[PDB]
């Protein structure tokens, strides 16, 4: 499968391209084999579904043979294999959604510890690299622990997630009070 990474709360676009530069019948399904959308619109009209009202395509691109699946307001649980079927061909895309948080809602004090946690789909083992406002780089798995924060650590941290050779970047504001 092609792997695509998404950020929690963000939008992701899963591309699908046909051999011919023209519109033709297509649909997207998930790994449970539920059809999501196709040429005639969203199939999710039979009751409550996880993706209800959050999945779309770009109808204006279909006549170029491009049939993307766009999912907005991403949840970790949207992580799934999505399958685009156009005529006789099927393309499988594994979407993996991640979210980044710190273990504080308001603020930290100089000398306190920081835990950065990548909320991750079940069974994933991403690697994470973060850069502090001072320019120092740290790396590890889904959870990074910083022993003590300095006043100079107050500001925007930048963290890159690596999973299946794909990367996605998060920014998070950490405030350290004196």
């Amino acid at each position, epitope marked *: 499968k092609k792997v695509v990474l998404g950020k929690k709360g963000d939008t992701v676009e899963l591309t699908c391209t046909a051999s011919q530069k023209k519109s033709i019948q297509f649909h997207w399904k998930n*790994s*449970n084999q539920i059809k999501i959308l196709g040429n005639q619109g969203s199939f999710l009209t039979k009751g409550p579904s996880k993706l209800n009202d959050r999945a779309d395509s770009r109808r204006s691109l279909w006549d170029q043979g491009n049939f993307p699946l766009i999912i907005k307001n991403l*949840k970790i*649980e949207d*992580s*799934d294999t999505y399958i685009c079927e156009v005529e006789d061909q099927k393309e499988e895309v594994q979407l993996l959604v991640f979210g980044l948080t710190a273990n504080s809602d308001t603020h930290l004090l100089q000398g306190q510890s920081l835990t950065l946690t990548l909320e991750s*789909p*079940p*069974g994933s083992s991403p690697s994470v690299q973060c850069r502090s406002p001072r320019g120092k780089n740290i790396q590890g798995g889904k959870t990074l622990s910083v022993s003590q924060l300095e006043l100079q650590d107050s500001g925007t941290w930048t963290c890159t997630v690596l999973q299946n050779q794909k990367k996605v970047e998060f920014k998070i504001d950490i405030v350290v009070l004196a």
Partner: nanobody
Amino acid sequence: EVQLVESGGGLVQAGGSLRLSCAASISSVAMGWFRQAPEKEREFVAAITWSGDYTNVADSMKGRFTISRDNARKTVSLQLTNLKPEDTAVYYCAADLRGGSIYGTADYVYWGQGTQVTVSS
């Protein structure tokens, strides 16, 4: 209501292979395997969709562990290979994600009592 009964645990040798089974008493729901060692968190091991067409084995266990199911027999199975002392744990069968993605959620409704696997060094 669904009953899940594991079998196949026991005392095994490092480097060996072991197949665990779980008998259910359905063909419409996702099923999964988990494991828990003493004084450690329960860990996701593997999941499989209702049809068996897609599986999700934990990244750290891919290419050692595989998962399969048999809807006619109402079973799901976990194949362990190249066993390590670190694999010692109770292994739990689970079922029903309420339609959720086996790649997106591990919040299964039904749980077995588990089968103990102990890997001798």
